[PDB]
Amino acid sequence: CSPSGAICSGAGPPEQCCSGACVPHPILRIFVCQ
Amino acid sequence: IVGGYTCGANTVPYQVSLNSGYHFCGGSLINSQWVVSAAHCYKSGIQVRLGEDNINVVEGNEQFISASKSIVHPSYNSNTLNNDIMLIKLKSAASLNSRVASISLPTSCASAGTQCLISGWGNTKSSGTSYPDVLKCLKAPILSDSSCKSAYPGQITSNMFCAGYLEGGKDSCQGDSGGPVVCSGKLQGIVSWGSGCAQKNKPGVYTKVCNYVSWIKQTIASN
Numbered sequence: 001c002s003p004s005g006a007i008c009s010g011a012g013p014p015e016q017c018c019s020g021a022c023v024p025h026p027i028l029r030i031f032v033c034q
Numbered sequence: 035i036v037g038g039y040t041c042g043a044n045t046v047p048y049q050v051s052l053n054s055g056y057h058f059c060g061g062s063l064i065n066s067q068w069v070v071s072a073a074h075c076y077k078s079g080i081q082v083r084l085g086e087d088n089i090n091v092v093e094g095n096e097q098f099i100s101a102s103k104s105i106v107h108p109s110y111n112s113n114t115l116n117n118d119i120m121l122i123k124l125k126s127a128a129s130l131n132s133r134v135a136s137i138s139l140p141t142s143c144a145s146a147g148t149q150c151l152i153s154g155w156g157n158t159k160s161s162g163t164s165y166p167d168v169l170k171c172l173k174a175p176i177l178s179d180s181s182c183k184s185a186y187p188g189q190i191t192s193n194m195f196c197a198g199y200l201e202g203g204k205d206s207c208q209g210d211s212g213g214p215v216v217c218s219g220k221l222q223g224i225v226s227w228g229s230g231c232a233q234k235n236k237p238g239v240y241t242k243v244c245n246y247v248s249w250i251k252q253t254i255a256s257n
């Protein structure tokens with residue numbers, strides 16, 4: 001699983017992030033792990 | 035893309051999806067072996083997906099090619115977002131056709147007022163989350179350097195430009211990063227950043243591709 005702040009896939013499974021949440025970055029136009 | 039429209043299958047044949055399982059960034063095919071994207075889209079084990087429309091359903095025009103090289107601009111500044119550009123080399127040359135095609139690099143920079151086409155599979159809502167199946171498009175003008183710097187005081191470098199609408203409602207959004215801004219047949223921009231999506235007085239900020247033509251050429255020639 002990915003650390004907080006690391007790039008993730010919006011439509012991916014939330015378990016891709018260790019935090020269990022893939023969220024919009026406020027500035028960059030990517031999703032990152034919560 | 036927020037406030038945009040359905041492009042139509044393969045009507046943007048230079049648009050690629052950067053994938054590591056699922057879509058995470060956009061990119062632009064600039065020749066049979068090379069893709070341009072954003073430096074903040076960097077990660078290991080990238081798969082490039084060409085000829086895509088509905089990214090969830092095999093429609094028959096796709097090509098799935100692994101990245102062999104992912105080269106972030108060596109002067110990329112993660113603090114200021116300056117030089118937010120990355121070059122991806124494909125393990126094998128893509129088969130170019132009517133539905134998978136390269137986009138030309140600009141020979142000169144574009145001017146304010148020029149309408150461009152921005153595209154991607156990113157969020158379609160400015161508050162909340164909604165992921166499209168198919169590719170979405172947006173027509174947007176390039177804004178004056180003054181209006182850009184007014185929108186983001188002290189944060190716009192000479193290698194960035196604003197495009198979109200100061201009234202909000204229409205913008206690129208999260209999931210669109212790395213994707214194309216194409217103006218009069220030339221790749222002029224890379225989806226980079228902004229303050230939220232489609233917010234008033236906060237248009238999209240894009241990497242100014244015309245300032246990187248030499249680096250792109252040198253990198254290709256030497257890799």
Ligand SMILES: [Ca+2]
Pocket residue numbers: 086087088089090091092093094096
């Ligand atoms: Ca597909």
